[model samples]
Target: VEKVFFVTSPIYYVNAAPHIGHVYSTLITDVIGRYHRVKGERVFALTGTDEHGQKVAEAAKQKQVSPYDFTTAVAGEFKKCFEQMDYSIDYFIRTTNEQHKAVVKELWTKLEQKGDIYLGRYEGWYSISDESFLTPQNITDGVDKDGNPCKVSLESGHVVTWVSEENYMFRLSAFRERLLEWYHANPGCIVPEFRRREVIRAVEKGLPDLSVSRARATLHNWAIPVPGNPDHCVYVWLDALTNYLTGSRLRVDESGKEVSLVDDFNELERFPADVHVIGKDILKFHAIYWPAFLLSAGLPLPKKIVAHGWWTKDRKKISKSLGNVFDPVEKAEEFGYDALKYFLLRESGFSDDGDYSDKNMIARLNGELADTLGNLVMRCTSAKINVNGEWPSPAAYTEEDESLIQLIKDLPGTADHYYLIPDIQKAIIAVFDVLRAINAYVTDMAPWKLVKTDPERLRTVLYITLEGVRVTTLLLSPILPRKSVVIFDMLGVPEVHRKGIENFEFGAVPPGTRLGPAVEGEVLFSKRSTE
Candidate 1:
């Protein structure tokens, strides 16, 4: 049986347009999904928008449109952004969808039936910007954009306001012990060991019963109504979190009709998602609240949650106010999607925040792609070198040739190891090590000069280099897909060999395999002139 792999990007909030950070989070999930599929696993990658929160509703009001209309428009932008970025998302779920609401309602009722939910007067500081409740300890004095005194969430630095309402609450406090037990049992349930400790620390500090509903009158009738209480609407986070389960169970027909794949019990049985890629800001919800809610519903918990850090420009947070916000789509268009993918996957540190600059991006593109990888492919495929326009037979192996072949053969396994951890940066960086080795091997072998002094050795060198390039392209297919496909096709690699990581092999291209003559092409990437 094929291993079932499930992964999700945090359904993006629709209060604003897609930003660099939003794309970064989705890219992380997309790369992992692609990696598993490349490894021949059954993969489902879910991404969508969270459209029911107060922030969205308020934004809709300012735009003078119904919340649904506003959300639908922004959600369309979200879909377009992901598509433009070439994300391989399996399902694009919307919280406003009927099936999603039904799932949330069902889980809410189940939790209530288990006595894990109760109506209570909730009094706390709430951050509309963050769509979360904060304790007094989490509140700090801060200034608004206009420099007015305001309370802000210490965790998110978003403005917070005092709120008091009678609402249905999840008995989150009751699950504190169980959460601790689960964390202890699953040491690596959360990635980036430090982020795991952060979540565990919060759980250890304590969890209060979470407010899971709001007065319908206050929410302005923009959210899912509580199943048994029309006076209240399901809290946005509860509605949002259920999308993960809803997405997993949803099936679309040839006509594009979405239907549930299974009943609640079976849905729960099928879940326990392999990974959830999210921002560190929401690590609290995914790590603590989400699992607690699942436990109350007698559902399975996710296998892992990876909280990646933020992106900054010039060492400052990416923000519109500072005029440093990165538009991922525009940047991709200018620099090419493959180049953008490389920088994000290779330059960004994966588990930690990385600074972004046009200079850094250009350097990586020119130095890594145009100069190193692209240059190697160009030289090996040149007609002057590869005489018959076919895979050349190598003479008896030199130690250096054997060493290069071993490195090429070993690349896929090494990359897959890092990908299984879902550390895409490490995986791409691992393949990059082979790229550097190939360049160094070329320098030492000097196929260019060997064309005169040692004609036969030159053929061997070019063949080894071509095979290495072919394998490297396959190894990189998941992260740099479009470019990899172009490179693979350039070398006359059959589609059959592109199916799975296991299919990647050294010398798979036997001598005389009829590699086509080099195709004239521009640089795989061009240096960006400016930001």
Candidate 2:
């Protein structure tokens, strides 16, 4: 079992401001990072922007600014967007970073020296929108916004153009069999299970040598140039993928020089990152080309690539042409981040696309958070329910109370299993499953009536109910950090116990312990107004 966990989100494209999809990717990476962190393991999380590309250059041109200025501003917006979500990262890498460019050029040189890179002529269809090369088989007839006929890539509705130029190529075709073996040996490599099969099927077809360089003239000099040949720029995808290593393999010395952290591959510093959480649309680049490049460089391949599906507004993925993108920053301003974060994780699992709509968000938040979780917290802590203003002293143990206690005790293990499987949605669902049961338990006991009829039993019910909330709150800390802190404060969860999951022991709340003050409507999640 590895003690260190490294998680990464694909460095986002800098041609545009971030959207809801970017938030989803970061949220997923953050959830994994925090889970390992609470498990008392070290974690390194990375997120950043891919600033060197044709699209970025064109966007800068239209904005009437240098690509340097354009990308810097967009990168600022990206950082602000994450901060608005209360997200965290260990390192943020941009392809434009001097260190990142150095690493990219170094890797390119090493690959070339090892005979894995060759300068060759290339002729193929290319998509500037995606910055990917496509074959005739991969494209189809499509129409542009002006209703003009054009050939486009089937996977993405981007117009394609025939290109024949001198470009550097990676010997991806040389490793087809080896890649197949790697996949066959590591069946768990691609999460969502179905994606693994898809990648294997793609590799079974003979691989083609990949074009890894572009012309400086076409790129408007917006990308990293080849190490020795300035006329040719390294492919944006190659430069972008190298950012993962830039975050790990090298550091700066006091003398203003670069330093290598790993002397051997047997125990790489973090080369085989535990997970690369990316969108399914770019699976080909990470799954196919990334591993091939790493393998050629004699570096270890990353362990897993988790390709999450898209978030659609109205049965269609967000696109500029449609003008249907959801701005998460604005939405977060209107409604708090925690409530929306909970709804996003709760609404969908990893494999399928999640439909984003206010109706759905309002309903899920009001129903789950406002009604289910919010109601439970309010009732248990309110004077009308507990009456004592302190942790209850149990007079006698009932079967139901023991059952609820046992469930709370067993929760960390159950939730951890899913968190490791990284069925993050299910991990979250497990917490709510207990919360729902606790709600039902609260209903069955009817503490309100017990308050009048059986004061002793009412106190016991409140104690068990409060303990349930504490555990649920801990389980959700990684997912809802901002809101969870408020809950811990509300519960007066001891300072030490609130530090990490290690101290989450049942019965930690001593009998007759003073409970924290509470206001009626001040809770973790407020009822969102739908209208």
TM-scores across all candidates?
A: 0.95, 0.93
RMSD value for candidate 1: 2.0
Q: CA lDDT, every prediction?
A: 0.84, 0.84
Q: List the residue pairs that clash in candidate 1.
A: none
CA lDDT of 122 in candidate 1? Answer: 91
Candidate 1 global TM-score: 0.95
Give the C-alpha miss distance for residue 169 in model 1, angstroms: 1.7
What is every candidate's alpha-carbon RMSD to the true fold? Answer: 2.0, 2.9
- Of candidate 1, the 10-residue stretch with the lowest lDDT total is 261-270
User: What tens-digit string does per-residue lDDT give for candidate 2 at 70-154?
Assistant: 9999999998888777886776677888878877888898799889988897898999899999989999999976999999999
